[PDB]
């Protein structure tokens, strides 16, 4: 984002407040736009944004989109008990596959990884 008077800034989402914009805030924004020499968004563009938000909020996600969002949050997932159990089970399956294939090098790494992940309370 960017203030008109100030410069560009990268901000996270939680900084924004759910409270509505007050009259002096919008007036100060208009004064900053006039100082920089900019205009306000057109009413046609305002309606286009409103329709875009309503369509996006009322949209129905597809299976592929839902899986992509789930994979994205799984990449963001630091830890979750169900997911840790599933990962440990998958690692155990990979470990038995490596043991049955007589691969003495992979199995040590999988055992070390399981030891690091494990030791619950």
């Amino acid at each position: 984002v960017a203030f008109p008077n100030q410069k560009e800034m990268v901000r996270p989402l939680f900084v924004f407040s759910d409270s509505s914009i007050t009259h002096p805030e919008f007036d100060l924004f208009l004064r900053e736009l006039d100082a920089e020499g900019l205009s306000v968004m057109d009413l046609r563009d305002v309606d286009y944004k409103y329709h875009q938000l309503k369509e996006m909020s009322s949209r129905s996600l597809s299976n592929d989109e839902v899986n992509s969002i789930v994979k994205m949050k799984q990449s963001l997932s630091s830890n979750t008990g169900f997911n840790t159990v599933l990962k440990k089970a998958q690692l155990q399956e990979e470990l038995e596959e490596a043991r049955d294939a007589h691969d003495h090098e992979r199995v040590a790494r999988i055992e070390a990884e399981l030891k690091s992940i494990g030791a619950e309370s």
């Binding site: 989402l13 924004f16 759910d18 509505s20 914009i21 057109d42 009413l43 305002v46 409103y50 909020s57």
Partner: peptide, 20 residues
């Protein structure tokens, strides 16, 4: 081409809960 009023901006309020 008309300027946007306060109510027009209020129609497109997108809260932090809505962002999440």
């Amino acid at each position: 081409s008309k300027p946007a009023t306060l109510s027009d901006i209020n129609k497109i309020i997108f809260g932090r809960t809505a962002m999440s």
